[PDB]
Amino acid sequence: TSASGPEHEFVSKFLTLATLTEPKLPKSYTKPLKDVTNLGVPLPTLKYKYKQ
C-alpha cells in the first residue's frame, strides 16, 4: 500500500540506476580464499544468549 510508496520508489529507482550496465563484480564473483588478507571490521555482539 501507499504508506511505503516513498521507499518503494527509492529502492526501485536505485536498483535501475545500479544495473544500467553489468555491475563491475558479478553475483558469482568470489575472491579466492587464498588471497583473503583480512576479515574487515568486528561485528557487534548480539544481545541474546545462545542455547540448544
Binding site: 500500500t1 504508506a3 511505503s4 521507499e7 518503494h8 527509492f10 529502492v11 526501485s12 536505485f14 536498483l15 535501475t16 540506476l17 545500479a18 544495473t19 544500467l20 555491475p23 563491475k24 563484480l25 558479478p26 553475483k27 558469482s28 564473483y29 568470489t30 575472491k31 580464499l33 587464498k34 583473503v36 588478507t37 583480512n38 576479515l39 574487515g40 571490521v41 561485528l43 555482539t45 548480539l46 544481545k47 541474546y48 545462545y50 542455547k51 540448544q52
Partner: protein
C-alpha cells in the same frame, strides 16, 4: 599393525598410561628413523581410540604429537592431511578443556603449510561444527565464514535457528542476524556466498513470518522489498552497491538511510575502503 593390537588391548583393559607410554616410545622410533607415514598412522590411530574411550587428556596429547610430526615431516595441506584431522575433530568432546588449543594447533599447521592466511577452508568447515556443539557460537561463525560452501549452509542455519530462538522478535531483530551474512561475506569478497545466503535466509524469513513484500526485478537483479523492514532493504541494496564499485551510488544509498549509516558506521567505512577506494574517513552525521 601388530602393536596397534597390543595397544588397543591395553585400552580395553583401561591401562591408559601404559597404552599412551608404549605407543609414544614406538612412535618415537618411527620418527627417529624418518618413517613419517608409519608414525602418522600410529599416532593418529592412537589419538582416535583414546578419544573414543573418553580419555580426552591422552588423545589430546596425541593430537599435539601428530601436529609435531606433521610439522617435522613438512606435511603439506591436502585432502589426506586434512581428513586425518577431520576424523579426529569428530571424536573430540565439545567440553574438552583444551578444545580451543587443539583447534588452534590444527589451524596453525594448516596456515603454515598452505597458501591460506587463516587456514584450510575444508578444515574450517569441521572445526566450525565442533565449536557450535560446544555452544561457542561466535567462534563457529568465524570458522564457517572462512569455510566451504557447506560452511555457508551451516552458517545460515546457525543464524536462522538463533533468530527463531529469540522470544521477543522485532523489526531491528531480523536485521541483527541478516546483516551478519551480508557483512561477513562482503568483508571476504565472496559475493556469490553473499547472494546465496541472502536468498536462503530471506526465503525462510518470508515463509515463517509472512511479511508484506514485493519482489522488484531489473536486469537480472532482485531486491525483496519489505514494507516494514527498511533495514533489510538497505542491506540488500548495500550488496549490489558494492558490486558496482560506484562511489556515488554508495553515497546516495547512505544519504537516504541516515540512521542505518550511523548504525553500521564502521562496517560502511570499511566497505567504502574495500570496494570503492575511499580514503576519506566517515564524517559522523550526528
Amino acid at each position: 599393525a601388530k602393536t596397534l593390537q597390543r595397544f588397543e588391548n591395553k585400552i580395553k583393559a583401561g591401562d591408559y598410561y601404559e597404552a599412551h607410554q608404549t605407543l609414544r616410545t614406538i612412535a618415537n622410533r618411527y620418527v627417529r628413523s624418518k618413517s613419517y607415514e608409519h608414525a602418522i598412522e600410529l599416532i593418529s590411530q592412537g589419538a582416535l581410540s583414546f578419544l573414543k574411550a573418553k580419555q580426552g587428556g591422552s588423545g589430546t596429547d596425541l593430537i599435539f604429537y601428530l601436529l609435531e610430526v606433521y610439522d617435522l615431516a613438512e606435511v603439506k595441506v591436502d585432502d589426506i592431511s586434512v581428513a586425518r584431522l577431520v576424523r579426529l575433530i569428530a571424536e573430540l568432546d565439545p567440553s574438552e578443556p583444551n578444545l580451543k588449543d587443539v583447534i588452534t594447533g590444527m589451524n596453525n599447521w594448516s596456515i603454515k603449510f598452505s597458501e591460506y592466511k587463516f587456514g584450510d577452508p575444508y578444515l574450517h568447515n569441521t572445526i566450525g561444527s565442533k565449536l557450535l556443539e560446544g555452544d561457542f557460537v561466535y567462534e563457529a561463525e568465524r570458522y564457517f565464514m572462512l569455510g566451504t560452501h557447506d560452511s555457508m549452509i551451516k552458517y545460515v542455519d546457525l543464524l536462522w535457528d538463533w533468530l527463531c530462538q529469540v522470544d521477543d522478535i522485532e523489526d531491528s531483530t531480523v536485521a541483527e542476524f541478516f546483516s551478519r551474512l551480508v557483512f561477513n561475506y562482503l568483508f571476504i569478497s565472496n559475493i556469490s556466498f553473499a547472494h546465496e545466503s541472502k536468498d536462503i535466509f530471506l526465503e525462510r524469513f518470508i515463509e515463517k513470518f509472512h511479511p508484506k513484500y514485493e519482489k522488484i526485478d531489473k536486469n537480472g537483479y532482485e531486491i525483496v522489498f519489505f514494507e516494514d523492514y527498511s533495514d533489510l532493504n538497505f542491506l540488500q541494496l548495500l550488496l549490489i552497491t558494492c558490486q558496482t564499485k560506484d562511489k556515488s551510488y554508495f553515497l546516495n544509498l547512505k544519504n537516504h538511510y541516515l540512521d542505518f549509516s550511523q548504525a553500521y558506521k564502521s562496517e560502511l567505512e570499511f566497505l567504502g575502503q574495500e570496494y570503492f577506494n575511499i580514503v576519506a574517513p566517515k564524517q559522523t552525521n550526528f
